Amino acid sequence: SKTRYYLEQCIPEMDDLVEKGLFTKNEVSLIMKKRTDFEHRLNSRGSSINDYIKYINYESNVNKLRAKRCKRILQVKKTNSLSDWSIQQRIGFIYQRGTNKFPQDLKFWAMYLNYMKARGNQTSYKKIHNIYNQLLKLHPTNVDIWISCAKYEYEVHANFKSCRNIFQNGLRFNPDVPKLWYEYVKFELNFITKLINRRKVMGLINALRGDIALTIFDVCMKTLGKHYINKHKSDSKMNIELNKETLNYLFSESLRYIKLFERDYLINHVLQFWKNPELYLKTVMIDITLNIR
Amino acid sequence: QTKDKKLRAGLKKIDEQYKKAVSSAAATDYLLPESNGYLEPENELEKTFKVQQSEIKSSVDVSTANKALDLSLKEFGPYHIKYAKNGTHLLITGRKGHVASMDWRKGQLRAELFLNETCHSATYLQNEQYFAVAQKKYTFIYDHEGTELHRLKQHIEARHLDFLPYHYLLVTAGETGWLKYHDVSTGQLVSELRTKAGPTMAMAQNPWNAVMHLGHSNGTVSLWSPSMPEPLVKLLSARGPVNSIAIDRSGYYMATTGADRSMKIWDIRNFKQLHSVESLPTPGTNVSISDTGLLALSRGPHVTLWKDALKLSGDSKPCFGSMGGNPHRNTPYMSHLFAGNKVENLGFVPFEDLLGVGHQTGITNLIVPGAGEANYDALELNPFETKKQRQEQEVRTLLNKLPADTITLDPNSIGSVDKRSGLRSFLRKKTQNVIDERKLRVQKQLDKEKNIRKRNHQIDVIEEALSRFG
Amino acid sequence: MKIKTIKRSADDYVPVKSTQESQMPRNLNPELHPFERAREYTKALNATKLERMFAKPFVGQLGYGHRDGVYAIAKNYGSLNKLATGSADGVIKYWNMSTREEFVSFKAHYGLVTGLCVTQPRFHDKKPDLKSQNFMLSCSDDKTVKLWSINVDDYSNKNNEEGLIRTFDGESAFQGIDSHRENSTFATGGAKIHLWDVNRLKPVSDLSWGADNITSLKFNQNETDILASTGSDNSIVLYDLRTNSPTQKIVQTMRTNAICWNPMEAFNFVTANEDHNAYYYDMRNLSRSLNVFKDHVSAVMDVDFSPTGDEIVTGSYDKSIRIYKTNHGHSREIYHTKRMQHVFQVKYSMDSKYIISGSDDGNVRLWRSKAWERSNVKTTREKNKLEYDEKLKERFRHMPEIKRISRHRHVPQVIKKAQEIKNIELSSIKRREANERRTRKDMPYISERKKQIVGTVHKYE
Amino acid sequence: PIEYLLFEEPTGYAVFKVKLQQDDIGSRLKEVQEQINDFGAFTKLIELVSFAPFKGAAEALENANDISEGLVSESLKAILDLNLPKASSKKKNITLAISDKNLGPSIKEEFPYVDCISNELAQDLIRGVRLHGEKLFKGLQSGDLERAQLGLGHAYSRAKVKFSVQ
Amino acid sequence: HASAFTRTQDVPQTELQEKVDQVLQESNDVVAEFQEE
């Protein structure tokens, strides 16, 4: 039925592949046998990610064999045929079906994304964005995938505005993640250093910059305090104890912000807001070591 | 071509749709799963008819060499072999009482019947389940365990029964000169025809046409249908009686063997015999056609297989030995001969490459490289069938069975188009007669007016002087 | 001596798992698939038998219905569930067909309702809510046009003003009504048709060929400035809005009870005509008719086009309702019940699947447009089998057995006997005309599409 | 036109996209109610698109209280902002199907381009979704729904009564 | 058909959005028989 439909979709590129002199009929028949096996194992009940991944692996191996055969038997880098994009379209369609049936597999989503980015020459910015929108709709509470899409866009296209909006949406969904706050501050400082080095090369050929990260830090500490209060919200002793646990949480986090950390001024604002026992001793030893620096 | 753009566009649209359909059929031909088997001599000294079943059994795999059987049951008479249409179940009927139906691949005996009444032939009718045997007098429909389901009474001395599965129709040619089409689904004698000529010696069905071919004592074959009580066609094939006939799966070629050491290869669709093998040392007992166009002949101790004898070339006429290796002589493709057995009958297996001969001691499957077609179709006939799938296909076929009168000479003939109280009662009869005479009178007047209109369509001195005096 | 035989990979043909579904190899060789015409003919025959066995046209009725017979029906062209029905008692109702219930029930007039329309007005004082309310426009017998709100629970984005937004007093008895769409401008046909604006209590313009009355109106769907009107000097008059004037008059033989434009051609319309007929007219060439629909035995009361634009449903003064195709000119199907009488209004639905039919026993029964297409969503296998059987029956439609079992529909005995009496009368008239043709020389061979037009005004050539 | 539909759940919100509509004239019919009841016929109508779970039980309690009072929550606003397509704010609004006429106007106020629907048809779709539950989640992780029901019910009731350790 | 990348309503919805936006705003036989038949 549906398997017959898919193999009939597979026919014409095999026709062109045997018509051009690079694959004999017995090889065609063996390829079609393995194709029928994989299509039935997919379409039946109880199919699995192992079946989809094995199908993808076999199709990639067939494409590599076709490439070696075209480079050897006639020594042309690219034939003017139908198959050369047909096999890649088949792999894309396999990935589409896999992510339509098992939309929980992070590993399969990552394999899809790395495949599309690796052949990203012929792919589309819009296609990667459609994949990322689908994945972010499905798993909105994965700071790993939020950071992954933002970091891809920042290191490939450096689209500061869109990466900023990506981080804003991710932080609207997950305020509870200091890893996400950490990476947003990292991106903001990377953007600031990029801008100031752009100004430096501009002066070669011919601070609000910190204050943005300071404001991010302030709203981070506020919402982190609120949400660690909400997690395990009772009398005066329990209130004081949860207050001290939240304080230790936030101040270990600000210590991590210092480890992330111009630099002296940012640390001054951090210790300022910290002031706003043993922790106080930690603050003053940070102060005397900064004065040493 | 006509000079009307509407008809031009319509016929061109139908033509391009037809072309798209046949090209998609060729695309399925690319999607075909398997490939046939071949036998090639590879040299000039080696000939294909010099091989042996022992050599081929050594040179092939273990599955086919385990499938190629040799059963010896020497107690009862020469056995008769019939496979199911699927190709999975076998049915042997001995000459005295032995009737066995066996799955034969997984090695399971479905039904064994000992009958002292001398049986002749038997067929799986619609599945492996129900099978019909012939007896000394009556015909018997048997269930799958071996129990007796029905004693068909009217089919008296049925010599050559055979079943045809789309119409669900059980032909029973016998001895008195007679032929009875009996529907097995409704359980009813549909047609009863008398054969004027004599005792019907041979019989086979044209499967594409689903019509019956009898071979009489005169030397003529005759093609019959369950509609009309005369034969559709009659062909003088040989002299004496016709021993056997076989018909290609395509329904194109017929092979007849007649007792005056004669063999004829006929074209059924055009009724010109392709040729006539006359060099026949002993009279041919049986003749079969495989699914791949391969011809099988049995003279009784000998069985001979020809490849490509069913075409129109002069080389396609089969011979029995070439002088110096003449390529324009059709040497026999593969031979075999037994010790002292007389082969009772023979039939190819449907979806493997074997032919089973039934002979005096038992059953033998000879391996052929290219006997049966490689890849079947699973919508029609499955050698792999679960029980629910089998019974569902049975109900489906019973739903879409074809009626009996459809059996004709041209299976496209359905599509044609043509333009095709006392005194009151007495006086009522009086006035009714008057009205009918009135109707006939006005009809005659209209006819007279039309005749004069047809005449207007097609249009001596003393006589001129007397012109207007009449 | 190179040999190779036919082996089967049993793991290929039968799968190693148990839950995996086995492969189904297919070889399309016509030598392998033998009986084309016979198999397809018997498939078409079983298809028609299953269709005649599964024909179940009646699906339900709309609540308790009205008291004194449904004489006005107006579907909602925008939405899908809402229609308005109007009894001859004076009460108008706004049915939700989804739950088969009402929204409100306005006892509206003293006299009969003579027309209904549903709409949305374009007020200049404010934009009224297109979404929380619908509006109805009832055209009375006692010289009144009343415009009503309906509170509608379609959308939930709010949370007064239930009934009778506005009234338009009149001079003559209003008899028909329709609303120029996209501009909210409604024309009412009384003794002379008036074009009214919603925000003007007096009739804005007068449209009148002569001083004869008008029975009904209808605007066209596309090119929406074209109006057509049926007047009781058995005359069809096309009116135009952008020139603000009558356009062309055709005088038939008998009075046309209804008219309906078609929504997919914009210049074809069908007229339900009292001589048992439905005449399918073009607009521009009014000297003939594009088609005739013939299978009634009493006065055709109402017609409607399917929104696909290919089928016409006609309800008659006889207690029956037929469905025709545009191409054939004969009844595809007839629906009838002992409980329905004098079907005075018929409206094909808006998604082209159902047929609402308001009879005069006070019931508004809705039927199926094909007696097989069930409402449930169907899997791809069954949908392919269903379209296959339909296409095959279409191909083998004209075989005698298929034609017999496809046309054998049970008709009530009164309609059957009236039809055969009508056939006897027509055959007798035909043989008298044949005898006159035999005798007399110069008689015109009148065409059966130009026969029923007494005279058009703007004699074009 | 029922393009998307919302569904509240004790473990968060789920936003589905409708593919094929049951026809709204035969919605009272035996066959359409039976294909709502059967699971394999429901997935031709409803596929999941987004599913955002609640962070903790206290956030779940506060969001359930806001749904009970009929207002919109921060997480709800975030989910709809991510999911719904921004069309023109004057014509061709995007259709969201919900279950509460009281929840309607707040959604409309927060998003002028969206249009809420709570019909008999929308209630039928939400009823089918509630019937099939975890089978519609395609393997996406959720808590035990019934354990979530018990916990949230007790927490919401203790909040509405003001139970006390005293 | 909205996405996670572009901003939807172009107005700050959270304190993060408004603060960073205002600071970036600052930063700008047989034969015979047969013949007989």
Summarize this structure as a short list of keywords or feature phrases.
part of a larger assembly; 5 chains; C: 461 residues; alpha+beta; 5-stranded antiparallel β-sheet; 4-stranded antiparallel β-sheet; 5 helices; 35% strand; globular; E: 37 residues; mainly alpha; 2 helices; 0% strand; rod-shaped
Describe the structure.
This is part of a larger assembly, with chains A (293 residues), B (470 residues), C (461 residues), D (166 residues) and E (37 residues). Chain A is an all-alpha fold and 293 residues long. Chain A has 13 helices and no strands. The longest helix of chain A has 28 residues, at 178-205. Chain A starts with a helix and ends with a helix. The relative contact order of chain A is 0.05. With 461 residues, chain C is of the alpha+beta class. In chain C, strand 27 (345-348) and strand 28 form a beta hairpin. The longest helix of chain C is centred in the last third of the chain and has 27 residues, at 413-439. Helix content of chain D is 41%, strand content 17%. Chain D is globular. Chain D is an alpha/beta fold. Chain E is mainly alpha-helical. Helices cover 54% and strands 0% of the residues of chain E. Chain E is built from 2 helices and no strands. Chain E has helices spanning 15-27, 30-36. The longest helix of chain E has 13 residues, at 15-27. Chain E starts with 14 loop residues before the first helix and ends with a helix. At the B-C interface, helix 1 and strand 1 of B face strand 1 and helix 2 of C. Strand 1 (38-40) of chain B pairs antiparallel with strand 1 of chain C. Chain C: Belongs to the WD repeat DCAF13/WDSOF1 family. Chain C: InterPro entries: G-protein_beta_WD-40_rep, Sof1, WD40/YVTN_repeat-like_dom_sf, WD40_repeat_dom_sf, WD40_rpt, WD_repeat_DCAF13/WDSOF1.
**Proportion of beta-strand residues of chain A:** under 5%
Helicity range of the residues of chain D? 40-55%
> What does the largest sheet of chain D look like?
5 strands, mixed
What shape does the CA trace of chain D take?
Answer: globular
Biggest sheet descriptor of chain A:
none
How many strands appear in the DSSP assignment of chain D?
5
Tell me the helix content of chain A: over 70%
Radius of gyration of chain A from the CA trace?
Answer: 27 Å
What order do the helices and strands of chain A follow?
HHHHHHHHHHHHH
Number of strands of chain A: 0
| Strand arrangement in the largest pleated sheet of chain D | 3-2-1-4-5
- Secondary structure class of chain D reads alpha/beta
Report the total helices of chain A: 13
Please state the CA-atom Rg of chain D, rounded to the nearest Å: 17 Å
Number of helices of chain D: 6
Main location (chain D): nucleus
Protein name (chain D): Nucleolar protein 56
Organism (chain D): Saccharomyces cerevisiae (strain ATCC 204508 / S288c) (Baker's yeast)
GO biological process, one term (chain D): maturation of SSU-rRNA
